[PDB]
Symmetry: C6
Subunit: 204 residues, 6 copies
């Protein structure tokens, strides 16, 4: 990462990420973890994070596909002049450079710490997150329509499932509709505009 | 966090927080842990802490609601001038900026390290803690009225339960009332103004 | 802590303390651990240490009581001038300021790093330790009078129990008296002034 | 590593690598881990990484063989002048120097931090990775031709196996061919040019 | 420790020591560990190490006794002038100051970083090690005279026990004498002056 | 270690080493680990590493013997002038000084950071490694002559055992000779000059 000087990604960071993906798979909270562990990361750093994941290769291939789509759109909006670059001068990044596949770390650092910056790390991270969001939505096991409160399920546990699902598929009305009959009666009686807090206290 | 320069949240910090919320849920001591792990945090840092929590999504939604209430009150007391901001100058933060949803890290650092500072990290942390306090009180399993000393419960174990409950629901009189008959006799005989220490030694 | 600049308490430190209190409860060695983990700590730091403890709330309440007693005595000996403080100047700390309940971290740092210093961290730590000492003595399970060497207990194991107890309740004569008959005979025969080393070798 | 000054490889780094090779053997993701843990490494550092591996000595011998092949090719393209080197001057590296077997750390640092640099760490790392790639391909247990979707295997689990295999042996057409009859029917009906995402949603 | 500036003992260091004493008790290697973990330590640091040990209070009392003996001898050889010390000047350390019981950390740092230094940390560490050596010898379970090679004990395992014992009680002749009859025959036949290496190869 | 300033050996480093020797004993990879963990170490540092090992005291005694042999040879080649050394000047190291038994850390640092340096850490490390190599060879359980491929042993597993053994005892011809009849037939048919890679692919 660039913290301005460059510092190698730490083994602690790498290991934390790889373990999260191992334990959580693609639960929604994995995206914030990725974003939080990669602050100021270069494209090379980001590729270390993705490439050290051993499992989930279907997902990782989908991710490459999304990245390639964004890289091709980058090339469309920002064509680079073909031909020998000015001796000693910073060149223009193309999509594959931003994605760190055809750029060196030295070049990435140069872009990222230039004045003004070409924020290749930040641009790449956006493409990755776009791809991760698709994966999170795909691996969500259950439709929000199928999250319904059980006959003996505490309201809080139901609300946990409801919002966990909503977060993945990435409301209060459906929330009341999908509640069991005893809670629904209480909830409807609350009237319009009840906060979640008021609903949860009511069905406690 | 801002320690003045900015430093990325550490994986150790993130992991510690996420594990606390996993193991303790919303026991009262989680609030001091949050406050202790987020010293000098920016709004982006604080959002990393909240967003990496995978479970308890009912609570996390309640928390968003409280934050939105405080953000709307911030907007009421401190309206921001609409229109193109002065070239190169620091803009005024609105509620969503303080909450880090419509502000960049660069802007947060600028506010927080300005002279004088606009302490957006400290303002946001107060809103979060206000929200966490409501959650702690909601998830408290038992009324202080129902914490009563068992027939064969050591006084110390009862006092532990009593003050643990009190802390969550966020005294000595109720304490004596809820004691068992053998201890209550001893306690009443102590007279008024006994310290906890004296009561505990008496019923040992 | 102040190490002169301020640095946030580390998660490692916090976690170490919380685990010690979990595993050891209030065994005597917990006090030196507290003192060793909080070197140069501000009142805010010290409160993080105490407040993140989840259990033992009877003890933690006793501790608050002792702190309040010391704070009231501080106020007695060092009254603070009431009224608007001199613009831009350092104010006098009262008891609740030293205890970090009515003071900000900024003020604590100012006091602690002033010339000469008002050592609020060191003053508060003394009050806490005074309170912890009372708790250690209260939670000591057994009277030194009841630590007696078993018929088949090795002398070393008995001496371990004897001094562990003594440390908590916070000698050689009682030590010999409480020894079993076979060791007592050997010990008495040693004569006066024997070192612990000589006694232990004799009963080996 | 060189981070410009030299810093010893960290025990954390060493331990992380040795554990990866223990747990993952030569699964493909081990190569990115190696590359990510050895950023800016000297030849001495790289040799520490390889030499501390206790098992897999067949692989480690194959790796030495590949390194020796690259070192002999280096000598072919870049012969070094034989005879006493200029007093106090930097000498030319031969293959065994780059591989760190006949060079000192001091010399490696000198080459790597010279102007312009002789990037011996980067050159050696390329030879190692070339060797590791051969090993990964050799230890791949199964031909991509034998990765076929089971009758009751979810499409996602099959795609995971397919791309994990492809990565090791280091497509969509074979992917559809090797699918079970129920998914193949759906896939063929999608028409040409379907993304992985579309195929996976279709067979979900 | 003093590394010249002072730095607080680390929780990692403290925890490592306390765990060693827990797991190894007073096996001989504990002394080198103590010495290695306390490099440049002040008396306060050293007291943190000793005082955080929860068990073995017989040993810890013996250790205090030895320290007091050395402190009284220090006072004998280096009496301190009684009376008000020169305003603002460094005072002379007595035994209890070196042992850190009547000296502040500030004073210890002053002594240790003075020109020339009064090396109170190094002097105290010597007294502690003297005390630890006595404890190690006391807790050695078995006489070197009783370490004899079993009928089916491999020579290497016997030699391990022999030198482990010797280290605690703190040779080749006894080594050969205590060997079993089959090895003794081989050893005697080696002649005088055999290295351990030669003996071990012979009885392999 | 000297990194130029001196820094105390880290508890992490110490603990890593002690654990390696516990788990691996004297498997060959322990030597590279020792060398990698002790970069720039002083003689005092190296002695911490050796002395904190609790087990294997036969080996540790053999190691002392080898060190003493090298120290006596050092004294033979580099005699030190006897008599009072020049006030304030650096003295000449003898063997026991290099081995850190009669030298202080201060003197070691002085030698190691002098211009030109007397590299006592590097000289001692060579003696230790010489001693460790003898131990590794002694504790190798099996002759390379006895490493033969089992009737149903995969070729790769056999090659692993063969090179692991070779490394300890510290080839392709013996490799083919010791192979089982089915692989030997294939191997012989490969002709001369086959790489390990080609042999392993052939017998896969």
């Amino acid at each position: 990462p660039i913290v301005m000087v460059h510092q190698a990604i730490s083994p602690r960071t790498l290991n934390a990420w790889v373990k999260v993906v191992e334990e959580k798979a693609f639960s929604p909270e994995v995206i914030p973890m990725f974003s939080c562990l990669s602050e100021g990361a270069t494209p090379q750093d980001l590729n270390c994070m993705l490439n050290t994941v051993g499992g989930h290769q279907a997902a990782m291939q989908m991710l490459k596909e999304t990245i390639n789509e964004e890289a091709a759109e980058w090339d469309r909006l920002h064509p680079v002049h073909a031909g020998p670059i000015a001796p000693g001068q910073m060149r223009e990044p193309r999509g594959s450079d931003i994605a760190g596949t055809t750029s060196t770390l030295q070049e990435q650092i140069g872009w990222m710490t230039h004045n003004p910056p070409i924020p290749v790390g930040e641009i790449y991270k956006r493409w990755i997150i776009l791809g991760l969001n698709k994966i999170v939505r795909m691996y969500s096991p259950t439709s929000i329509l199928d999250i319904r409160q059980g006959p003996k399920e505490p309201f809080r546990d139901y609300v946990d499932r409801f919002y966990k699902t909503l977060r993945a598929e990435q409301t209060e009305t459906l929330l009341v509709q999908n509640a069991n009959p005893d809670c629904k009666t209480i909830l409807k009686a609350l009237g319009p505009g009840a906060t979640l807090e008021e609903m949860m206290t009511a069905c406690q």
